[PDB]
Write a protein that binds this ligand. Structure first.
Ligand code: SF4
Ligand code: SF4
Lengths: 114, 96, 176, 208, 113, 82
């Protein structure tokens, strides 16, 4: 059952890495909003950051969350430098996407999808 | 090829070469666009006897790779091949 | 087996030195390049007068697709679906049913000219020479939807270009 | 079997078998398998922990001198528990030879990077990380190299569909290029072309 | 002979190839003396290095030394000696003559699946 | 920054500036996870507000043990002269 670690031996250092990545994203959100001339406020960007971290918050494997921290670090570096355009930053906010119905009755009305 | 002799002479002087010997514009020297019909030959397997497919099946002679070592004396050291031979300089145009 | 490009040592006698210095001061090779471009000015240009003159082509040329017929009016396609099976871009859609006299004929034959890569696999996978790639290439359209051919469009293309497609096939069929 | 069958090389087969024995005997700590194919190609399957020592030996030994790294690839085989097979192709100009070094890893185990041996491995395993999600430890600068800047998922894996999950279109309301769930006007038609009859009896697997 | 240029860019011409090669081969032998005797790497590299050292010591001229060493120029032979010394030190550090670290799974190298 | 009363007032003021937490239940000895029901990330951005307003950074070793405002006041009193 012994496996080779990536960066974190157990869950505590993995949680520290998650904490540091969240701090870096929270610091960069105002500069990302200003430099890209986004139509959102700083609060909406920070709520999106917190929403992504909360969506990804049911994992207990140290290697999986190490890979998640690594991919978040790549995204943060991708945004700090101007490599993403405005479309890549705004792709987190699905503005043009139609609201998907959630209850049973509307899904029954619109199609066969469960 | 329709150029005058004076223009040909000036062209050859300024170019430094005889341009009329090797013209880049094609003329009636090329092959015609309508050709007589061909008759292509047949291959070596177009025979009526001694032509069994089991005697010339290339794909069926392919074998699985031979396992040399598996984990399930004073022998000489071995290179992957004899060492490559040194290249010889070109006799035609060595640029030397 | 190999040769030494750019391994010529420069001579250091006074003749070669003065030749190189005169070439530096008087710009000899620049005059050489100028003179040869001047010589290239006085040649007949290789430009043809399109659309009044067309570039040369071959009977193997792959242009617009067409559906052919037997020399009795009957169409050649018998709905064997080999062309849509061999199509590397999946540009062909075929649907078939037996028609009134029981013949095996297509009811739908679509070729997406925006998916097709003009590779000619369909005209060489056809056992009856039904689908062909005709010699026409000037069929640019102003709309995307005009490039989605159905069976009627391909049959019209065949009826339009039969007098050339049959001659090209007659010229080339001995090489196949 | 003269005209239409590929002629067989046996001197090269003998030499490659001898060199495979040589390598597998010099490095027993990492080498797990050595095989030579029908068309005289030598494959050395090793443990993932010995990627650096085996490659450094093959690069620096006087009897190996495999100075060129031609290609670095990963292959996705989902039925294995270590589904990713990492393949190094090496070329030796001194002896005019080629070798293949294979190792394995799964999704969560990192592999030691071979930038410190061969410098082409930088971009090659950056591409491998981009397409298969295989992490390479001790890399100088590991990011994506071919996919889109906001792309999620590794496309060369075999559970990733051919057409992706999103598609791009220009929206005039937001005056921007936007990504939407994928919808195809014509679905990609799947063809079942496998013959139900056995083709090559020499590759027959034993029954359970 | 005093070759002006070895032919390869960045490879400087060696003025005294014999002393350099002898020093490098003896250094390789002293480094390899630390590896255990039963290790096949030590036996093979000792054999090939002793052959190369005898060939170098038995030939005063360089052109016939280059011809019978079968390694191209003498400077790339010196380069290969340096690379072999570096590999010998790294192989002292790694110790790859030990038994196999771990067996693969049952169908790790089975193709086709 | 020089007096403990001013330190406590600045800490408590910028804690009242935090939007999602009521000022009524906030005292000097209120926990974060079980008193106001703040998340881990809530405490994280509270600590980043601490560094943003007090002008000195806080590492992740010692930011994990700041659950009530008295602990924050005592820590930043340790890091300063006071
Ligand atoms: S030319 Fe090739 S790509 Fe085009 S329809 Fe024929 S088979 Fe398909
Ligand atoms: S290959 Fe020829 S006969 Fe067969 S379906 Fe296509 S066009 Fe028709």
């Amino acid at each position: 059952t012994s496996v080779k670690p990536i960066f974190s031996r157990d869950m505590n250092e993995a949680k520290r890495r998650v904490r540091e990545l969240y701090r870096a994203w929270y610091r960069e959100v105002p500069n990302t909003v200003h430099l890209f001339q986004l139509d959102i406020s700083v609060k909406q960007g920070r709520d999106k950051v917190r929403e992504m971290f909360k969506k990804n918050a049911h994992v207990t494997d140290p290697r999986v969350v190490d890979l998640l921290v690594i991919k978040g670090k790549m995204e943060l570096e991708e945004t700090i430098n101007v490599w993403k355009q405005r479309t890549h930053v705004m792709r987190f906010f699905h503005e043009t996407e139609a609201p998907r119905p959630k209850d049973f009755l509307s899904k029954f009305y619109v199609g066969h999808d469960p | 090829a329709s150029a005058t002799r004076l223009i040909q002479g000036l062209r050859n002087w300024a170019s430094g070469r005889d341009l009329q010997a090797k013209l880049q514009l094609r003329y009636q020297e090329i092959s015609k666009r309508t050709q007589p019909p061909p008759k292509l030959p047949v291959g070596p397997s177009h025979r009526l006897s001694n032509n069994y497919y089991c005697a010339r099946d290339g794909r069926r002679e392919a074998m699985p790779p031979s396992i040399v070592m598996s984990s399930q004396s004073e022998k000489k050291a071995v290179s992957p091949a004899p060492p490559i031979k040194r290249w010889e300089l070109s006799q035609d145009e060595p640029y030397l | 087996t190999y040769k030494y490009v750019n391994l010529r040592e420069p001579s250091m006698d006074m003749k070669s030195v003065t030749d190189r210095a005169a070439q530096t001061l008087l710009w000899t090779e620049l005059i050489r390049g100028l003179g040869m471009t001047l010589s290239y000015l006085f040649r007949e240009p290789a430009t043809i007068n399109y659309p009044f003159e067309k570039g040369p082509l071959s009977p193997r040329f792959r242009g617009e697709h067409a559906l052919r017929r037997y020399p009795s009016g009957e169409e050649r396609c018998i709905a064997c679906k080999l062309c849509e099976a061999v199509c590397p871009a999946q540009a062909i859609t075929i649907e078939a049913e037996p028609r009134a006299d029981g013949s095996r004929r297509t009811t739908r034959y679509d070729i997406d000219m925006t998916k097709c890569i003009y590779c000619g696999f369909c005209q060489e996978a056809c056992p009856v020479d039904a689908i062909v790639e005709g010699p026409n290439f000037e069929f640019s359209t102003e709309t995307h939807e005009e490039l989605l051919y159905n069976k009627e469009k391909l049959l019209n293309n065949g009826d339009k270009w039969e007098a050339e497609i049959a001659a090209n096939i007659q010229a080339d069929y001995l090489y196949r | 079997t003269r005209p239409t069958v590929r002629p067989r090389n046996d001197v090269a087969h003998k030499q490659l078998s001898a060199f495979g024995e040589y390598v597998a005997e010099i490095l027993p700590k990492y080498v797990q398998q050595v095989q030579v194919s029908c068309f005289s190609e030598l494959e050395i399957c090793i443990h993932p922990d010995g990627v650096i020592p085996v490659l450094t030996f093959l690069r620096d030994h006087s009897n190996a001198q495999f100075k060129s790294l031609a290609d670095l690839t990963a292959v996705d085989i989902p039925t294995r528990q270590n589904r990713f097979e990492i393949v190094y192709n090496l070329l030796s100009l001194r002896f005019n030879s080629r070798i293949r070094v294979k190792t394995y890893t799964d999704e969560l185990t990192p592999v030691e990077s071979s930038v410190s041996v061969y410098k082409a491995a930088n971009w090659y395993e950056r591409e491998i990380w981009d397409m298969f999600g295989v992490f390479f430890a001790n890399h100088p600068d590991l990011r994506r190299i071919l996919t889109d800047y906001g792309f999620e998922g590794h496309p060369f894996r075999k559970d990733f569909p051919l057409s992706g999950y999103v598609e791009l279109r220009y929206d005039d309301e937001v005056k921007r290029v936007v990504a939407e769930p994928v919808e195809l006007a014509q679905e990609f038609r799947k063809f079942d072309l496998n013959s139900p009859w056995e083709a090559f009896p020499a590759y027959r697997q034993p029954p359970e | 002979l005093l070759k002006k240029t070895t032919g390869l860019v960045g490879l400087a011409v060696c003025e005294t190839p014999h002393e350099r090669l002898k020093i490098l081969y003896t250094k390789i032998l002293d480094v390899l003396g630390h590896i255990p005797k039963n290790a096949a790497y030590r036996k093979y590299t000792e054999q090939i290095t002793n052959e190369k050292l005898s060939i170098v010591k038995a030939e005063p001229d360089v052109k016939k030394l280059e011809e019978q060493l079968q390694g191209g120029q003498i400077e790339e032979v010196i380069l290969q000696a340096e690379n072999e010394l570096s590999l010998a030190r790294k192989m002292i550090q790694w110790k790859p003559w030990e038994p196999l670290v771990e067996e693969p799974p049952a169908s790790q190298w089975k193709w086709p699946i | 920054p020089l007096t403990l009363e001013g330190i406590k007032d600045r800490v408590l003021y910028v804690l009242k500036l935090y939007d999602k937490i009521d000022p009524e239940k906030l005292s000097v000895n209120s926990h974060f996870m079980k008193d106001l029901g703040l998340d881990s990330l809530d405490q994280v951005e509270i600590i980043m507000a601490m560094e943003d307003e007090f002008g000195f950074e806080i590492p992740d070793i010692d930011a994990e043990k700041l659950m009530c405002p008295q602990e924050i006041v005592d820590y930043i009193a340790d890091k300063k002269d006071v």
